[PDB]
Design a binder for this molecule. Sequence first.
Ligand SMILES: *[C@@H]1O[C@H](CO)[C@@H](O[C@@H]2O[C@H](CO)[C@@H](O)[C@H](O)[C@H]2NC(C)=O)[C@H](O)[C@H]1NC(C)=O
Ligand SMILES: *[C@@H]1O[C@H](CO)[C@@H](O[C@@H]2O[C@H](CO)[C@@H](O)[C@H](O)[C@H]2NC(C)=O)[C@H](O)[C@H]1NC(C)=O
Ligand SMILES: *[C@@H]1O[C@H](CO)[C@@H](O[C@@H]2O[C@H](CO)[C@@H](O)[C@H](O)[C@H]2NC(C)=O)[C@H](O)[C@H]1NC(C)=O
Lengths: 49, 33
Amino acid sequence: TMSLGAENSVAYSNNSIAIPTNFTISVTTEILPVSMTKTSVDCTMYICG
Amino acid sequence: KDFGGFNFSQILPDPSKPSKRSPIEDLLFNKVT
Ligand SMILES: *[C@@H]1O[C@H](CO)[C@@H](O[C@@H]2O[C@H](CO)[C@@H](O)[C@H](O)[C@H]2NC(C)=O)[C@H](O)[C@H]1NC(C)=O
Ligand SMILES: *[C@@H]1O[C@H](CO)[C@@H](O[C@@H]2O[C@H](CO)[C@@H](O)[C@H](O)[C@H]2NC(C)=O)[C@H](O)[C@H]1NC(C)=O
Ligand SMILES: *[C@@H]1O[C@H](CO)[C@@H](O[C@@H]2O[C@H](CO)[C@@H](O)[C@H](O)[C@H]2NC(C)=O)[C@H](O)[C@H]1NC(C)=O
């Protein structure tokens, strides 16, 4: 049975905050298709030659 | 559930239900046939 994620319990309280003291410059890739191969079929030649 | 007066019981999961769904989610699953 597949796990959904690592279990994290957020330390919530009514008067506590978490402030970052540092940062990471993260570069991620996103691949998106744009076009296909332009195909033309001669219908008469395909059916009959 | 001390959120400064904000109540999320209708959207948080219900421990009493075996399906662990919220009351709103339980109603949504009952209303779709
Ligand atoms: C902020 O404080 C809370 C509690 O003082 C920390 O939460 C605990 O983290 C330890 C280590 O992972 C756990 O074993 C405890 O169960 C956590 N307690 C609660 C109530 O969640 C939290 O890690 C602290 N935040 C930072 C950034 O140090
Ligand atoms: C914030 O994080 C960076 C890493 O992203 C820290 O830079 C590192 O510092 C240690 C100790 O001086 C070096 O050994 C590493 O080589 C550093 N890494 C890089 C990429 O420069 C930086 O010190 C952190 N700053 C604070 C205030 O925590
Ligand atoms: C959050 O909302 C729920 C429901 O809206 C509250 O539960 C009601 O509590 C009263 C008295 O405690 C009961 O008479 C109702 O029957 C309860 N309704 C349900 C659906 O359980 C709840 O008290 C509110 N507050 C908190 C802190 O959870």
